[PDB]
Write a protein that binds this DNA or RNA. Structure first.
Ligand SMILES: [Mg+2]
Lengths: 507, 84, 83
DNA sequence: TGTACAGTGACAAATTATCTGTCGTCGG
DNA sequence: ACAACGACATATAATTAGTCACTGTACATCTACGATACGTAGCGGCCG
DNA sequence: TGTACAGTGACTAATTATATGTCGTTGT
DNA sequence: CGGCCGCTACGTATC
């Protein structure tokens, strides 16, 4: 290869040598050039042989030949190899696994071996630091390494399969994951609840935020189903959100890309994906999915750090007043966060581009305007019970609840596919297999509960209590084990009440 | 020691639960060797002249009289009254 | 250091009006023949500015010279090195 | 090619207290 | 006779190991645990 | 006046690759 | 007396 070297910051001594060399650039004659050397021996206080060496160092190296080169020992240690290997490997072994041995502690191991070997000059602690110095800088550098980024309109998302998804247009690849927000919220009475969970759905091509879910609720394939319908459907917000632009963003993904959480690697999201026709894809590392993750730092920096009750990004940065200074309810935080996403965030510049907004790039990036799906057809969100069988008397029994259906007595002994809503299990949609296809059969209803609404976590909590209470299984008996615990509080029920009040304001 | 958790969660070695090995009896063997042979034998700061133990022992107003172990019955809890 | 204190030759010095400068850097001047009192100067763009006097604390009344304080310090280091 | 917002070096422009001429005034 | 290069000797700051006074930051109850999913096994009721 | 250990500027001693003379040798 | 089929319970994995 090519091998060049250039001098810099030359002057401090070297300008005197440079002026000597400038006076000597030409062998004018054998008589005169010797006189020029013997004259230069007045500017440098040195013999003819020192000036002849200077001229040879200049002619063979150029300007660096004026500068004094560093000694051959620079960076080598005089303590001998035994001690240099003992010190290096002792450090490394002592920082193996969970151990975090300090150089001082390494020096103690040096004095201990020197005592065993009857040495008299075990390296001093100051020299231990020096010997370990280079392998500490490396560690600090290896943490600090920057990565460039996608540049221009071309983007290839890596999966856990080693396949890359080429992101060609708007709604080609959506992405999703969850996080805690960093604000403690209060109930409608001003008492502490908990820090909400935020879900975001993003389109990869435009980086526009295509939908959210905010709530005290837990990450679940239900919260993902709700984030999906909010992303897919056309969006409506009332004047109490004070929006000055529209979240005009909707339609159905071709692919959905996620971390490996049990919300996403689930049969429920598989069934949603098969019915909507989108393919579920797995993120290979957290560092591949920055389009999901980075909305979250921006929101900490642009929104949540400026709100009362802020908790910091971690426990070492927690404002000590966070538990006393909380003020917002979930309905206030959503009314702030939705505004932020519609008026600010989707209207800001797409950073890869510099000359489009995130929304402008999404809208112009559709291959065609997609048709709005009917709100009833989002019943593909309903969970599937795969292999329950019809009992004689036209009956289905399910999470203790017993169901009756309009044609269902025709199919006693047969196997049926049941589609249901975890928010309301009073009613079941019954499908059956015919010609190796599902066909709709009937809207079965929990007998004697046709006037009544049970969510699955209520029927489940009532069943747990009923099992442990030792009472019999029936549709009312389960309702009886709800209505007391309803009427008679526990943080999850208090959270659920505030979350419900937000869902009411959605209607 | 194996199983070190760092000072707080931000330092927690990812292997802390993979690398735990000591029983409570073994940690106490180590901790008492350390306190007797090392910590109480180190030089007292705020002085520099004296070993920490030597400063305790020379510091005494008098040699204390040992208390018979049975006379640490005083450590028993009192139930302030019961009525016969 | 807090309350207007400085460390010099292992002695601790307390400044007369210095307490407002805690956590600041100051420079300082003294006569080697007698380091019981030290003169503290604030640092500025082309100048040192005289700030206040500071006096040694916890020492014997007899006036302390600089060479004598170095000696006290090497006696402590020698004693520590016996352990 | 992970990612995108806030903080930070590097450079340019308008304003003002400060350094320089030139002249006038006063003292030795 | 003049200039350039090497042998040999001699003095020299760069580098490293060591010592010392001043200072920064942890000790100050605290992440194993909660919340989802799947995958497999079990309990009695109903039928042969 | 919290409290005491590990890391850090500031200075010094031992070692060495390196710059300087001085002379011998060779080319011109 | 023996076998088959809904609703609970334990074990494992991941954010
Ligand atoms: Mg995740």
């Amino acid at each position: 290869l090519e091998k060049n070297v250039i001098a810099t910051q030359l002057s401090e001594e070297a300008q005197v040598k440079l002026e000597v060399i400038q006076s000597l650039l030409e062998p004018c004659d054998r008589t005169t050039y010797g006189q020029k050397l013997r004259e230069a021996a007045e500017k440098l206080n040195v013999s003819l042989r020192t000036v002849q060496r200077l001229v040879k160092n200049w002619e063979q190296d150029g300007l660096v030949g004026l500068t004094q080169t560093s000694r051959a020992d620079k960076g080598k240690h005089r303590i001998g190899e035994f001690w240099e290997n003992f010190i290096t490997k002792t450090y490394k072994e002592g920082n193996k696994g969970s151990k975090r041995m300090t150089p001082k502690q390494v020096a103690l191991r040096v004095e201990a071996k020197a005592r065993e070997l009857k040495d008299s000059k075990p390296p001093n602690y100051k020299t231990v630091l020096r010997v370990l110095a280079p392998i500490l800088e490396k560690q600090q550098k290896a943490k600090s390494i920057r990565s460039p980024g996608w540049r221009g309109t071309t983007l290839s998302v890596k999966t856990r399969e080693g396949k890359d998804l080429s992101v060609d247009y708007s709604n080609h690849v959506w992405q999703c994951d969850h996080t805690r927000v960093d604000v403690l919220l209060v109930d409608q009475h001003g008492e502490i609840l908990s820090r909400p969970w935020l879900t975001t759905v993003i389109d990869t091509y435009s980086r526009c935020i295509m939908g959210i879910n905010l709530g005290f609720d837990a990450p679940s394939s239900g919260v993902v189903a709700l984030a999906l319908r909010h992303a897919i459907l056309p969006k409506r917000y009332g004047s109490e959100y004070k929006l000055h632009c529209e979240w005009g963003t909707y339609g159905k993904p071709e692919h959905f890309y996620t971390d490996g959480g049990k919300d996403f690697r689930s049969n429920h999201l598989s069934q949603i994906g098969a019915q909507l026709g989108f393919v579920c894809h797995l993120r290979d590392r957290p560092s591949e999915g920055g389009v999901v993750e980075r909305p979250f730092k921006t929101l900490n920096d642009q929104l949540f750090s400026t709100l009362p009750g802020y908790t910091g990004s971690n426990v070492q940065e927690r404002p000590e007043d966070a538990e006393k200074d909380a003020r917002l309810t979930l309905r206030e935080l959503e009314q702030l966060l939705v505004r932020y996403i519609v008026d600010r965030y989707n209207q800001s510049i797409d950073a890869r581009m510099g000359d489009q907004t995130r929304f402008e790039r999404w809208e112009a990036g559709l291959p065609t305007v997609p048709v709005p799906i009917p709100e009833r057809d989002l019943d593909i969100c309903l969970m599937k019970q795969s292999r329950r069988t019809v009992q004689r008397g036209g009956c289905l029994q399910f999470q203790n609840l017993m169901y009756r259906g309009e044609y269902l007595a025709g199919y006693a002994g047969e196997t049926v596919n049941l589609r249901f809503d975890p928010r309301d299990i009073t009613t079941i949609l019954v499908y059956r297999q015919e010609n190796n296809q599902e066909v709709f059969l009937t809207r079965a209803h929990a007998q004697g509960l046709e006037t009544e609404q049970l969510a699955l976590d209520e029927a489940e909590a009532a069943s747990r209590r009923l099992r442990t209470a030792g009472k019999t299984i029936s549709n009312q008996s389960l309702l009886q084990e709800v209505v007391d615990r309803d009427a008679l509080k526990e943080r999850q029920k208090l959270e659920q009440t505030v979350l419900r009040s937000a869902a009411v304001d959605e209607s």
